[PDB]
Symmetry: C5
Subunit: 310 residues, 5 copies
């Protein structure tokens, strides 16, 4: 029983985040526990304050017509508890629910350690007969409770795109809104826990540029190659595999390259030396002592600028 | 209270995908959040437009008789919220629900990295007394919302097989439909993340074809064999094990072969050399430098053509 | 309000498997989505065909008395949707629900790679006052939908034990039925993925029977021992650990024995050689070249016959 | 509407285990599917046998007052289906439900492989006005269905402590009962799968007491140290980590000790030999050949007696 | 129908923890099963003791107005069962439910092995018209059942902050309470299971300060580096990765430092020795024998004081 009106019915929305949590880097989802405030004029149940009742009259969701506000990018239904309903004498209804849902918003790990994400919460309403348009009341949208957090992240801003996107879906318009939670990853431990140890093992590997014994250098390079893979297993992360090409996966691919040419060099040095030609061997090794750290530094500056400064 | 008719009742179907997600390569399932549009003529509740009411009359699922549409290949029930019911003056009902279910469709990984899948959604309806036959309305079947995604995949087409499969199950005919979601894996990272590093370690392994020391070559081949397994553990995937013989599992089996015959070669070279016969040893090793990369390239071309070009 | 009869009430059962899935080798459970058809004579609601109504009359589960059919070996309750209820003029009721439950049936992995399982579905009914006995209608029991599958398995037969087991539980008899889903594992990949590579590494291990250097043989045997464990980690399976002694675990234990006696041999060969006695050393090594593959083949034939041929 | 009596109301209890499963060694929980039988005299609904009705009268839980029996150590609520209610002519009620719950009972792994556990199920009842005291009827408590199992365990006895513990909680007495499920771990595979292979690798480790090359012994002891950790990773168990000190963790700590002093010895032997003192070196090594197996056997007998024989 | 009063309505709260469990170090959540006692004066249903009824009158939550008490930091809703409602002759209501919820409270692992946590449970109540303020009754807050436990922890004190935080949220005040569960980790096994073996491998690593062979020292240091990583994988913990810098992660980073400079030393020792300069080589090695354990002990004392004694 919708409210008969003279023109499109505006339903004012608003989300107050109480809790944010369970940011799943794998499934690109996150869980939210928030408020949902809705308001619309339904003069059909406007009441007399002086004639009877009081300043404001409260109803049960059974009694009144409520706009069906579904979320778009939610896995299941939006687990909801109705907190309050308050009708104004002119017919202005004030709806407030406390919901919890896991939202499905895509994540872009192309800069994995130093990346920022913008989660989405989408609200729509299908139009039964009178056309329905959702808009946002800023005062009810101040969604961030101060003590709301994602442990690995910093929370920038929870805001909303005021302009709705009025679709046309199966011979009926729909009004879509766009709530946006802006986060940015906080990455202290990655320098001590991930990168620096992975560079320690790699340096150890090309300590064989000051050595001559093929046996020691293979027990050097190859044994450290196992340590690299073993350490990668130790620091295996939920998004270590990604369909697109990440940044962290480029330098991690380059690390796998610098073990190959390290094996290539000690093999070349060994062949040159064993083929009565040590002048060339101990010259390639001398060069490697500088060539490897520079080509590394270079290609990492090339790679850093490739993803970040571009 | 079914609709008494003169002949079989057609129920027009249609599914509008709102969300696709959680494609489980292990359990061969995937989650879907979509619309379900149904329409059928029930002149038993045809209404008078002019005499009373308006253009269209809305009912509650309790009031009217609704056709029971079950999904076949769904794990549990199909979590549904009824969005709208709209009866037409002639008695044409317009049903619309928004459901979410995890569907069970078999996946064929015989070409794992470069594979295409056709997910299925099966609709059936049992016949209470009047025979029931489902068919599809293309206009309500345009299932793909533009911003729907599976992160590892590209989405080709959401279509439906217009011809139903009319069964006979326990003295009652049933009508089954076939909705098809066609996907194809997107595999950028696999060359840098999986294949190339796994080929690097194998090349390192047969660097012992330019070496003579049995100690170094066993510390060579065998140490890299550990690196192969360790890297396979690092890049362990949900479907690495499969009951049938995959492609990726064939070349991965061949990799395990080329470590054996590499150990076979360095062992033969060592025996020939130690049995006062170095002419033959350093001749088999000379051959290995070419024999191994070619038989590999060949058998991989043989293997690629075996699965793909056939 | 149960049906007053003259003697025990028979309730005819039947299960039509629509889906089988999620065979959990660990928890010895599996998920099923099937039909459940029940029928009993309740002349208390026999109706007059000509005098009124039609051929068959439909009721709501509220209206009628329904026998409480519980499952025995189900984790929780049996998620049920009532599909149809159809009473016959003589009072014969036709109940049909579509349920989904995860069943708990023990699994016997004593032949793990090549094993067959018989899953159970147990139905019981307690007797309120009139004694209740369940039996099976074969026509409603044809449970296998043709396109039902467990990916790792072949599905032999879904049948039912016609004879019920009538218990006596807390001063009231109960009638138990036994539905049996017979499966047998399909094991293509195990030869290429599990057994053959695990035999490759073991062959590599005792290549030290054609070598003399203790350093190479320890970097041989011991380095390959790590590869065995690492590969076992790579191919770790849900049921690798079991309280009873499996088959695959016997040969996997034997593999661990042949590394010990391999270390024993190379240590003994080294001691004999270093104690100015090379005649005996290079004689024990000569023998090992034949003793190890034969005792293996033998003890594996002994092991195969022990589990399978007995 | 509680039953007015003359003195405290006794409620007779009883639990019939139908299924036991999902014994979670980590979370110290386990799942149970059982019967719950309750009986109490409520002469307020004693009925006339001859004047009307029959031998026994059945009610709906709505109609009658039922004692609220909660479980203490259950995670959530206790998923219940009401099977039967049977009132006796004198007013004796016979309640029977079939519940399923996961119970929370602490586990003591101080003897992990060879340990016995006593799981608990706690029943309490708060007193509304008349004081309530629960006790057990032995005939309805025979909880073990014969074919009930925990795969890794043997089930000794399901019994109950007849004496309740009558508390006083928030100005109201409560009556607590103690049901006890006694299990003892069945540990066949642990000798072949865990201990024996872990002892093999340790034996291999101190095969370096019959060797002189420091290179072979470091490629011996240290390479086997990796194998120990890798095998521990292969046989990683749910309760491998525990806050208290387990038995299995003591001998596993001692294994880590015997690798250190093995490295200690070969280093000392190498130093003594290289410091022109081979008489002392080859004398410490001679001693190690006996000292290590004896101190091991000893300290394990010391450790076995410390946990078990004490 | 709220209770009309003369001034703000006080609602007295109280939580009796029955069970604590599932402390999730990863998601910083924990599960609780407790009582919730509420009391407020609603003279609107004050009753006449002598005129009718008895001492206390029981209602159904339907009949009475109950304050909506929500939890703030809970994932979903708070699974609740109403145990008792008791109205006093003056109009004082006694509400009592038994709930179970998983709470979301941040955890600080900056002292991981030796850390104490203070979990929070937050109660609020929105004000319908009359202002609502919650406060705590100490007698009903005695939350700790004696036999309540977290296996890895000791439970210090369950108390509550008597002063509420009265907010102003969307043009309506709310009253927030703060319940505090104080725990402290109990860390016996960490010395035998985590630290001591990880120090054993590190000691083994720098046993190469009493050796001269570059081959043995690289098969020494590097082989133990794999063992360090492998052992870290064996002892992988839920919170091993954290966005902030933990204590345990600092000393674990230092361990990674002492493997690098250990390789640096043996490489420098080898270069000095091979560059006809053994006086300097065997002098740097002599110094390392003391410098490494002291700088370790030092930097660990510096590190311990840095986190704990500051």
């Amino acid at each position: 029983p919708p409210p008969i009106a003279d023109e499109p019915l505006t339903v004012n929305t608003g989300i107050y985040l109480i809790e944010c949590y369970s940011l799943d880097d794998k499934a690109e989802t996150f869980k939210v526990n928030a408020f949902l405030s809705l308001s619309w004029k339904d003069r059909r149940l406007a009441f007399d304050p002086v004639r009877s009742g009081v300043r404001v009259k409260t109803y049960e969701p059974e009694a009144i017509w409520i706009p069906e506000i579904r979320f778009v990018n939610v896995e299941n239904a939006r687990d909801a508890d109705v907190v309050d309903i308050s009708v104004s004498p002119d017919g202005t209804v004030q709806y407030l629910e406390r919901f919890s849902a896991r939202v499905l918003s895509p994540l872009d790990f192309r800069r994995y350690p130093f990346d920022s994400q913008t989660l989405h919460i989408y609200l729509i309403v299908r139009s039964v007969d009178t056309r329905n348009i959702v808009l946002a009341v800023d005062l009810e949208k101040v969604g961030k409770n101060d003590d709301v957090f994602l442990t690995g992240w910093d929370i920038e801003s929870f805001t909303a795109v005021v302009k709705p996107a009025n679709f046309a879906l199966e011979d009926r318009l729909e009004s879509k809104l766009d709530y946006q939670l802006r986060i940015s990853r906080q990455y202290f431990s990655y320098i001590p826990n991930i990168i620096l140890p992975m560079l320690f093992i790699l340096f150890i590997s090309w300590t064989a540029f000051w050595s001559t014994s093929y046996e020691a250098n293979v027990t050097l390079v190859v044994s450290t190659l196992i340590a690299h893979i073993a350490f990668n297993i130790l620091v295996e992360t939920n998004l270590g595999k990604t369909p697109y090409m990440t940044y962290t996966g480029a330098i991690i691919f380059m690390i796998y390259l610098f073990y190959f040419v390290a094996v290539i060099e000690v093999t070349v040095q060994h062949y040159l030396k064993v083929e009565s030609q040590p002048a060339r061997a101990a010259s390639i090794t001398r060069a490697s002592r500088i060539a490897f750290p520079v080509v590394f530094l270079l290609a990492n500056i090339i790679l850093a600028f490739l993803f970040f400064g571009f």
